[PDB]
Design a protein around this ligand. Structure first.
Ligand SMILES: *C(=N)[C@H](C[C@@H]1CCNC1=O)NC(=O)[C@H](CC(C)C)NC(=O)c1ccc(-c2cncc(Cl)c2)cc1
Lengths: 303, 303
């Protein structure tokens, strides 16, 4: 038993992190087979980033402007191209530690693990969720660009995020491994705001099930609610609506606890309208929305 | 920016996790050089764990009763011994993935990363704190024993925890890598209760320094206090007293903010006596006590 924010073991991704240098600027790159992937704003000077014409800057570089280091071994760049906001560097040796991998684009509300790196060296790993406004509340400092997010399915790594920038509110924005940003952001050095964020309702309910599996039940009630009447209150409180697909995905947790999904919705509806009265749920003073139903089942199956 | 519970990258430890089986009982082991470390109750049947005599059970075992597997690859046991509650198995292969490492016994309040493993397979990694009552609020299921806790300085892994037990209240108990339990627990399948827990004062202080560093400093006063007076008052509120070493590890944060340790103590003492008054500190209404001064330094500086 117990419930903790848990990330996937980072070892398979650690063996792929490298350092990429162009002139004065350095960031992290992902070395899979004989290709290194990194954010394209590595080819920018401090002045270029204000309003960069990337295709211009790229055509003015050659292979020898790129210094790639794996540990203390420099890799020779023999090719380069640009796919959206991601620069791809072909090297002359394949990574012997390349795992089975795929590039995926995740949906809002889904979670992934982030391996925060600096100068190609892993610093830490933590679990994130893609917000409905397509930001992530990560922990990134200068030089963390090129850090990747991922999930692991069996022994296959699904890369879903590469970090590019921070927003004035302190949240973070990035791309998939095809170089396409999540959300309406661009890799400029300009202040950019996201849309108003909402709470991931299906995740909150999954976390309420986790709280009950671990013995916390003070918030349960005996009101009932229809799916529509719950969604009416949810949207009023800036919560994402619950789909029937969301209801079905909560099924296993409903079966384990004997609490129908709509009864858990009634409990949550009361929490939104009443508050927590200074009480806590799994040691939290706030309703937590960065655990998916999959994340809860994986941790609580077998009570 | 951003503030999160962060685990160390687990790659160095993943390469040391193996599977140890005796009869039908399988748990996890730690493979460093040519020795495998695991909980000694692997030599127990389910009925044995009620009232085990461990050397009576151990002397009835020889090297060929132990199945050690790294993946599907078996490591032949060429020697065995018992050190406290940890079984050591000498194998005929030195782990080529052995990192630079160290065995340490941590103090209450110190944090570490846990690599949760099942059948020798890492499943997740999360951050933990040793509570004052010598339990950890972790997340463990059946077959998780032998999972280890660790810190990483430079490239040196400091192993500090190996998992043994779950208590009725859902918290967990284990030993250091020399087999000595943290707290007054024993590896027997009997009812054992953890003591009443307390708040880790040095970690709350570090978190107050983190708030000040980020411009959130309404809670500072002009009062000062003695170390003795603060400790006597803090125990009245279920807070741990500060040690000599606690003051010493708050030094860097004290120097960075220019706020003396005893002045921050006087600031926390008001917060305990007067409450929080519906105000916030780093976005929270709760004081956080599972971030050490090192966790704060390393996450507002990068590593
Ligand atoms: C990558 N190494 C780096 C990582 C971020 C820096 C600190 N935290 C991060 O997550 N990425 C960047 O520095 C990018 C580079 C662009 C995409 C070419 N820039 C920003 O993240 C950024 C842009 C603009 C502002 C800003 C501007 N005016 C006012 C304010 Cl309040 C903020 C901040 C950051």
């Amino acid at each position: 038993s117990g419930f903790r924010k848990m990330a996937f073991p980072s070892g398979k991704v650690e063996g792929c992190m490298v350092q990429v240098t162009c002139g004065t600027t350095t960031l992290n790159g992902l070395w899979l087979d004989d290709v290194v992937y990194c954010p394209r704003h590595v080819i920018c000077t401090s002045e270029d980033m204000l309003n960069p014409n990337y295709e211009d800057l790229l055509i003015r570089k050659s292979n020898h402007n790129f210094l790639v280091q794996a540990g203390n071994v420099q890799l020779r760049v023999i090719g380069h191209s640009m796919q959206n906001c991601v620069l791809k560097l072909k090297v002359d040796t394949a990574n012997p530690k390349t795992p089975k991998y795929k590039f995926v684009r995740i949906q809002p509300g889904q979670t992934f693990s982030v391996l925060a790196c600096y100068n190609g060296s892993p610093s830490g790993v933590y679990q994130c969720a893609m917000r409905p406004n397509f930001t992530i509340k990560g922990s990134f400092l200068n030089g963390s660009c090129g850090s990747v997010g991922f999930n692991i399915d069996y022994d296959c790594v699904s890369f879903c995020y590469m970090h590019h920038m921070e927003l004035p509110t302190g949240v973070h924005a990035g791309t998939d491994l095809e170089g396409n940003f999540y959300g309406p952001f661009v890799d400029r050095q300009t202040a950019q705001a996201a849309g108003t964020d909402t709470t991931i309702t299906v995740n909150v309910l999954a976390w309420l099930y986790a709280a009950v599996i671990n013995g916390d039940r003070w918030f349960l009630n005996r009101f009932t609610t229809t799916l529509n009447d719950f969604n009416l209150v949810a949207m009023k409180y800036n919560y994402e609506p619950l789909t029937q697909d969301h209801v079905d995905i909560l099924g296993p947790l409903s079966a384990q606890t004997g609490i129908a999904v709509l009864d858990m919705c009634a409990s949550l509806k009361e929490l939104l309208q009443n508050g927590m009265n200074g009480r806590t749920i799994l040691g939290s003073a706030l309703l937590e929305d960065e655990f998916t139903p999959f994340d809860v089942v994986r941790q609580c199956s077998g009570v």
